[PDB]
């Protein structure tokens, strides 16, 4: 009894160029499997046409990955001329009691290193700054480095939020609900590595692994320009 995201127009593009991977890195529904009316309790269209993603556990996952209409998975120059730009908007609800960190929106490599991600977090300290309730920007400091650098991007709010992540020639930023919150951080030391956008709900850290993590989009879309 669940509705499936197809059912929505503006979701076929990237349902098209997507595959869905639940609760860990094992796809489930590939392209043609989300177009034909994918749906289950971890990834359904709300009434009011979300596109809802719902996970318990530590580390585990309902989340697109980039693919390529062909099939192909994506896996672009993390430092090419070409830009790889995706949006999304996104209504992030209160979290479940002893969910600590949700991540939402990733750029990650072809092997094992996200290059970003985007996050909700309980908390965060940040050079002796302790934000409570926000949204998170965390850059890898390189594949070798598990160190990473987090710059707080927004207050959480329940509202509907525009994200937008361009990433162009070493840089990548971060625009939200318009404004620019990360101006052009360096991704140099992914030279060399093949990159890929996520998108959905990747629970992190929680601290009761029964605790459900939910992540709604009304709009999600990731493109390139050459
Ligand atoms: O505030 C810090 O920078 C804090 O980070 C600690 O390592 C983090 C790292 O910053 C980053 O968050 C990483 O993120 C993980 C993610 O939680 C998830 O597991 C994903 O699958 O892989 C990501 C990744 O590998 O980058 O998780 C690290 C962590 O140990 O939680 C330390 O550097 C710490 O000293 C520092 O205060
Ligand atoms: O997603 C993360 O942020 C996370 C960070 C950890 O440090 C790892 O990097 C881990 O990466 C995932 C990654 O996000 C993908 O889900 C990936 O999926 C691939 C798997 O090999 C599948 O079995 C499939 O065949 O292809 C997938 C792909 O590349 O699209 O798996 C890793 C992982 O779990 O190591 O998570």
């Known amino acids: 009894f669940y509705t499936a995201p197809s059912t929505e127009s503006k979701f076929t593009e990237v349902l098209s160029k997507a595959k869905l991977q639940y609760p860990t890195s094992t796809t489930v529904a590939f392209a043609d499997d989300l177009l034909?009316?994918?749906?289950?309790?971890?990834?359904?269209?709300?009434?009011?046409?979300?596109?809802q993603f719902q996970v318990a556990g530590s580390s585990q996952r309902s989340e697109l990955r980039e693919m390529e209409t062909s099939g192909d998975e994506a896996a672009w120059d993390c430092t090419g001329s070409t830009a790889h730009?995706?949006?999304?908007?996104?209504?992030?609800?209160?979290?479940?009691?002893?969910?600590?960190?949700?991540?939402?929106?990733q750029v990650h490599d072809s092997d094992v290193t996200p290059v970003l991600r985007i996050s909700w977090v309980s908390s965060i300290?940040?050079?002796?700054?302790?934000?409570?309730?926000?949204?998170?920007?965390?850059?890898?400091?390189?594949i070798d480095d598990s160190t990473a650098t987090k710059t707080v991007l927004q207050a959480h709010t329940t509202s509907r939020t525009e994200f937008n992540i361009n990433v162009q020639n070493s840089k990548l930023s971060i625009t939200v609900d318009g404004t620019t919150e990360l101006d052009e951080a360096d991704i140099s030391q992914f030279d060399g590595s093949t990159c890929?956008?996520?998108?959905?709900?990747?629970?992190?850290?929680?601290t009761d692994t029964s605790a459900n993590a939910r992540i709604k989009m009304?709009?999600?879309?990731?493109?390139?320009?050459?």
């Not at 730009?85 to 929106?105: F, H, K, N, R």
């Not at 300290?125 to 890898?140: F, H, K, N, P, Q």
């Not at 956008?197 to 929680?206: L, V």
């Open 196 to 206: 890929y956008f996520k998108a959905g709900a990747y629970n992190n850290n929680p």
């Open 36 to 51: 034909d009316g994918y749906a289950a309790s971890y990834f359904y269209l709300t009434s009011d046409l979300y596109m």
């Open 85 to 105: 730009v995706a949006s999304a908007q996104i209504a992030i609800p209160v979290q479940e009691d002893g969910i600590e960190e949700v991540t939402i929106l």
């Open 125 to 142: 300290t940040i050079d002796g700054v302790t934000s409570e309730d926000v949204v998170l920007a965390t850059i890898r400091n390189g």
């Open 218 to 226: 009304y709009e999600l879309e990731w493109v390139d320009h050459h």
